[PDB]
Design a protein around this ligand. Structure first.
Ligand code: ZW0
Ligand code: CL
Ligand code: CL
Ligand code: CL
Ligand code: CL
Ligand code: CL
Ligand code: CL
Ligand code: NA
Ligand code: TB
Ligand code: TB
Length: 129
């Protein structure tokens, strides 16, 4: 599924991401934009051999199992394919565990480099939330 901007904002809010660990909804919408371009089926292999899955490009090194990342963990206890579903429940629940780790949303390189410090509120501008 390719979400619309306000569609995804609404979905994230419903699953409890808005202000989760202090991060306003627009931070999550901006991160999704630049991680996946709002496409729940996005996948991208990393140079270390891990792969990033879904709307929030959750990484198999630590968070889900894809059977092809040696030495990795599966801390969200899910197959990585579950993170490609049209329903974002699995991705949100995992993202909550990720952002609860020590680095917050900096674990998302695209958030750090393209959302952090910017006027992220503009990403929910005009949304009927
Ligand atoms: O800054 C940190 O998180 C940091 C610092 C030193 C040591 C640890 C231990 N981590 C390993 C490092 N990985 C952080 C780097 C991830 S990335 O940004 O490079 O991609 C995160 C994976 N961890 C998930 C987790 C779950 C619950 C609690 C904690 C925690 O207390 O750390 N961690 C498992 C153990 N973490
Ligand atoms: Cl915001
Ligand atoms: Cl990740
Ligand atoms: Cl693996
Ligand atoms: Cl392994
Ligand atoms: Cl959904
Ligand atoms: Cl934080
Ligand atoms: Na893994
Ligand atoms: Tb950690
Ligand atoms: Tb530590």
């Amino acid at each position: 599924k390719v979400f619309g901007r306000c569609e995804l904002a609404a979905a994230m809010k419903r699953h409890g991401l808005d202000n989760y660990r202090g991060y306003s909804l627009g931070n999550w919408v901006c991160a999704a934009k630049f991680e996946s371009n709002f496409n729940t089926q996005a996948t991208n292999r990393n140079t270390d051999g891990s792969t990033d899955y879904g709307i929030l490009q959750i990484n198999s090194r630590w968070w889900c199992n894809d059977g092809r990342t040696p030495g990795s963990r599966n801390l969200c206890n899910i197959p990585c394919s579950a993170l490609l579903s049209s329903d974002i429940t699995a991705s949100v629940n995992c993202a909550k565990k990720i952002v609860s780790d020590g680095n917050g949303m900096n674990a998302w390189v695209a958030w750090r480099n393209r959302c952090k410090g910017t006027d992220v509120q503009a990403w929910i501008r005009g949304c009927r939330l």
